[PDB]
Design a protein around this ligand. Structure first.
Ligand SMILES: *[C@@H]1O[C@H](CO)[C@@H](O[C@@H]2O[C@H](CO)[C@@H](O)[C@H](O)[C@H]2NC(C)=O)[C@H](O)[C@H]1NC(C)=O
Ligand SMILES: *[C@@H]1O[C@H](CO)[C@@H](O)[C@H](O)[C@H]1NC(C)=O
Lengths: 52, 438
């Protein structure tokens, strides 16, 4: 039971960390276009990453 | 050749020893222990046995007075009483109505069966160990008695064996013990000369033949009843009988490790604990040269069936090719599984079968047939029987091999998670690099 719970927590923290880091990477990639007055994101980056 | 090995201290468990010298065929020694005796050094300090009270006939003096002097006897009690009128079957004993005196005295001395029935007390010390070991190899098969202390060297078949010292210094006997007939107890006892009435140690003696004795039993005298001749005395009963009534729980039914305790001399047997180092010096005549030994090439192993249990319920088959028939030495290089046979019968057919015992879900081990070496992996099924009367015949290991099913599942799950993490970190790195280039 200890081994099962330990493996489950390790897997959960791994997947959560990977997802959070991917989301942070997307945010850091798409931040500058939101700060530029006017203009717009290209549809390629808007399809690869969900752009509002 | 000087070689060293460690053997687990379990009675009845066979042990396989491998000897490899370059230029000669490997040799396997079958070693076993048949009985182990653990004896401590004892120094007697006293014994105890039931006592008796000696009281002589009272002295009656008519028309006079008496006065008794003290003597050197254990718990000697004497007293003089005035104003007595003794009576007998005929009539009065003296004319004097109220000028008679009676002297009474009593003491205590060890019983006449103290030599045959007694309980001794002992102080424990460091304990030495003696064992009996059966050794077989080749045409030699013999049992020898050894002192496991690192000193007693035994020569069997022109071969020198040295044993011990034991790796754990553990004894079941506490500092103070009490021995009675066939029973030993780890109960403390009062020191010499400080016994108390009604309990253990009321009567004390240095040895069975000692002439001195220490007694403390609260022997009290009383005044005789009028018109009678007798001596009234009150005394607490013997503490030895009370102790025999309520001695407690014996060590024979309480000792750990299943040690069998026996007396005369006080010792314990079959104490399964620790392990013994052994060192052997072998002659060259007992081995075989290579060019007389068959050469094995392209050795491949497989498993027929496996059911882990205390028995030998596992069989495997080995495939080979040689140049001449003969006898080879077979061994397993891991304690995960244990083989049964030490010598293998090699022939031109190229197929042999072996038995083994194991306790893991999926064992993997390296087998060696003469000079050739191969690997064996298997999957085993649990047994159905619950209770068996024979002891386990394998080392206790349960950790599965890295290639087992469960560990394989863990492995691909971990690999997938690691691949996902590597992809994520690579994506973050490239994003941050292209960001910083700006
Ligand atoms: C015979 O009996 C008389 C008493 O009837 C004893 O005399 C007593 O002796 C003691 C010893 O000194 C005296 O204290 C008493 O006063 C005596 N009694 C009388 C009545 O005189 C005498 O000793 C006895 N003799 C023998 C040989 O037993
Ligand atoms: C070794 O000798 C003992 C003594 O008779 C015997 O019981 C035992 O079976 C022998 N071992 C073998 C392998 O023959």
């Amino acid at each position: 039971v200890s081994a099962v719970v330990g493996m489950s927590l390790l897997a959960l923290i791994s997947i959560f960390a990977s997802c959070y880091m991917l989301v942070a990477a997307r945010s850091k990639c798409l931040t500058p276009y939101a700060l530029t007055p006017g203009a717009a994101v290209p549809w390629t980056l808007g399809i690869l990453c969900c752009a509002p | 050749y000087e070689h060293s090995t460690v053997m687990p201290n379990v009675v009845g468990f066979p042990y396989k020893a491998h000897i490899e010298r370059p230029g000669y065929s490997p040799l396997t020694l079958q070693m076993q222990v048949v009985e182990t005796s653990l004896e401590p050094t004892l120094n007697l300090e006293y014994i105890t046995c039931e006592y008796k009270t000696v009281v002589p006939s009272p002295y009656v003096k008519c028309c006079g007075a008496s006065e008794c002097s003290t003597k050197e006897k254990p718990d000697y009690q004497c007293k003089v009483y005035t104003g007595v009128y003794p009576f007998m079957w005929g009539g009065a004993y003296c004319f004097c109505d109220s000028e008679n005196t009676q002297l009474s005295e009593a003491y205590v001395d060890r019983s006449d069966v103290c030599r045959h029935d007694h309980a001794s007390a002992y102080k424990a010390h460091t304990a030495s160990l003696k064992a009996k070991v059966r050794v077989m190899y080749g045409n030699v098969n013999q049992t020898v008695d050894v002192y496991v202390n690192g000193d007693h060297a035994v020569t069997i078949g022109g071969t020198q064996f040295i044993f011990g010292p034991l790796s754990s210094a553990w004894t079941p006997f506490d500092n103070k013990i009490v021995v009675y007939k066939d029973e030993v107890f780890n109960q403390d006892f009062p020191p010499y000369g400080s016994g108390q009435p009604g309990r253990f140690g009321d009567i004390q003696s240095r040895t069975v033949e000692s002439n001195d004795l220490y007694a403390n039993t609260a022997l009290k005298l009383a005044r005789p009843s009028p018109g009678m001749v007798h001596v009234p005395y009150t005394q607490t009963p013997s503490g030895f009988k009370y102790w025999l009534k309520e001695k407690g729980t014996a060590l024979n039914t309480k000792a750990p490790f299943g040690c069998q305790i026996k007396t005369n001399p006080v010792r314990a047997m079959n104490c399964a604990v620790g392990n013994i180092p052994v060192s052997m010096n072998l002659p060259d005549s007992a081995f075989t040269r290579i060019v007389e030994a068959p050469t094995i090439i392209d050795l491949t192993c497989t498993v027929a069936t496996c059911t882990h249990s205390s028995d030998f319920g596992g069989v495997l088959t080995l495939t080979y090719k040689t140049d001449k028939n003969g006898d080879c030495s077979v061994h397993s290089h891991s304690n995960v599984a244990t083989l049964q046979e030490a010598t293998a019968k090699v022939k031109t057919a190229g197929k042999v079968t072996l038995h083994f015992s194991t306790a893991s879900a999926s064992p993997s081990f390296v087998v060696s047939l003469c000079s050739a070496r191969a690997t064996c992996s298997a999957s085993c099924e649990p047994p159905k029987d619950h209770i068996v009367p024979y002891a386990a015949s394998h080392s206790n290991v349960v950790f599965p091999d890295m290639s087992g099913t469960a560990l394989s599942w863990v492995q691909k799950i971990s690999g997938g998670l690691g691949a996902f993490a590597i992809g994520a970190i690579l994506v973050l790195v490239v994003v941050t690099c292209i960001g910083l280039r700006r």
